[PDB]
Design a protein around this ligand. Structure first.
Ligand SMILES: Nc1nc2c(Cl)cccc2s1
Ligand SMILES: Nc1nc2c(Cl)cccc2s1
Lengths: 263, 265
């Protein structure tokens, strides 16, 4: 793993592991989501840093608000996948982190991802109003000209997601996170929400289709002692609408869309 | 990753990842269990397997774990390189044993060790049987002939009998279901998920004030993707020892049993 020549992006190679692949001997979308997360932590570490150095005097952390992933080819077990990552300021809204996934043998793009991050107080949760000016210490680690993984005007990564209406077509109820679903700070890692969203997708769709696009909006965090319900409705390639909510009160924690192609 | 000079063992280095560590910034026992599993698959691949042979596939026979014993001294920190050496050995007609040695890549010292007992089984009927003569001769060429034990001790805890947890249990984690990330390429529940399920009944205070030293786990029945599981725990004992029992919620069928040993940080 290493920063590129200009220092405005980071690169890392990953050999696909045996337990990381699904029933078709290619890495799962959760494995890919974990690799995007790993290369982001090593990029933060290489430039001197979910927690991040500075802004900790105000008890300020970066939280994900949206994660959009689009895969063309899932890497096979044993293959090397190279991931390039970078960040970019979006004015007073927050930060955007993009990823490009390539095959290490061909050098061809096999996937791409984008995320929207926002500044939040780690104690009062919610958000301490994301709008900072003297936080210009991140502009030195970002490319100045726009560099977008999803550049096209009117693309899937910026479309509004509606709220799943009751009743849902499919549902996976009573989901609880175990100690392997928590990070070093004991919060549920964002990849577990992706796994929970896919639990409501019927087995037949997973066996006859491959996941092409997955857009996920983060609204609330699920605690280690909370129980979750996963809801799904076919909206259409097969398209779906998703809703994660707390099994009791029905408090919304997540919402999203998935797009699937026939194998 | 590569086989050693003699071809009777395999070695592989692993950099510890951010999501692989727990609250102490060191790899979890489930992460370690996954690395032991990964190095075993790469050792099977390096000697021409996929770990069945043309003889085992002809009879619809597969290898299944019966016991997994892991003992950790130091858990590798996030960013550190851990080298794992693995090898197999015939145990007559009972089956095979696979041992592991974990070392620090900077110091070269043993930081952990593991052992497992594997048995021959028809993948369709689930019936166990003693290893046949013509099958055993196909593995002897990939195993050291003289004994090579990770746990050589005269009375090591890796061969001790595990009793059945009596009701009522002291602690319990009820209603555990495996998701699609808990399944392997053949859609069976990954052996490592049972370790995570066993540790779910351990109270949070014990995890926060202690570190896991030893974990012995016996596999009796496999859990299907649609089964619900109950995890039971009772303190049997500085060091805290526990007795564990994984059983199906629907009718209480025993699937797993084991013991864990913990020391104060
Ligand atoms: N908010 C930002 N975080 C980062 C990191 Cl972690 C690495 C490089 C650039 C930036 S801009
Ligand atoms: N049963 C056995 N399987 C193996 C494998 Cl997979 C590698 C090396 C030695 C042996 S003996």
């Amino acid at each position: 793993g290493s920063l590129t020549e200009d220092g405005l992006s980071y690169k890392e190679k990953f050999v696909v592991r045996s337990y990381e692949v699904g029933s078709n001997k290619t890495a799962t979308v959760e494995t890919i989501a974990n690799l995007l997360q790993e290369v982001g932590c090593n990029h933060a570490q290489s430039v001197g840093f979910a927690t991040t150095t500075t802004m900790r005097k105000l008890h300020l952390i970066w939280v994900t608000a949206r994660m959009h992933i689009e895969i063309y080819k899932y890497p096979a077990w044993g293959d090397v996948v190279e991931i390039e990552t970078w960040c970019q300021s979006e004015g007073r809204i927050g930060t955007r982190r993009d990823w490009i996934l390539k095959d290490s043998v061909t050098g061809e793009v096999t996937g791409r991802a984008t995320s929207k991050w926002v500044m939040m107080n780690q104690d009062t949760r919610r958000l301490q109003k994301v709008s900072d000016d003297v936080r210009d210490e991140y502009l030195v680690f970002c490319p100045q000209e726009p560099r977008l993984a999803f550049p096209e005007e009117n693309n899937r990564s910026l479309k509004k997601i509606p709220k799943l209406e009751d009743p849902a077509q499919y549902s996976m109820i009573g989901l609880k996170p175990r100690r392997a679903d928590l990070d070093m700070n004991q919060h549920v890692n964002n990849v577990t929400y992706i796994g929970w969203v896919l639990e409501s997708i019927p087995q037949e769709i997973v066996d006859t289709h491959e996941l092409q696009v997955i857009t996920l909006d983060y609204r609330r965090e699920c605690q280690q002692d909370d129980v979750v319900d996963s809801l799904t409705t076919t909206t259409s390639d097969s398209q779906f609408l998703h809703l994660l909510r707390l099994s009791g009160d029905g408090q919304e924690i997540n919402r999203g869309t998935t797009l699937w192609r026939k194998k």
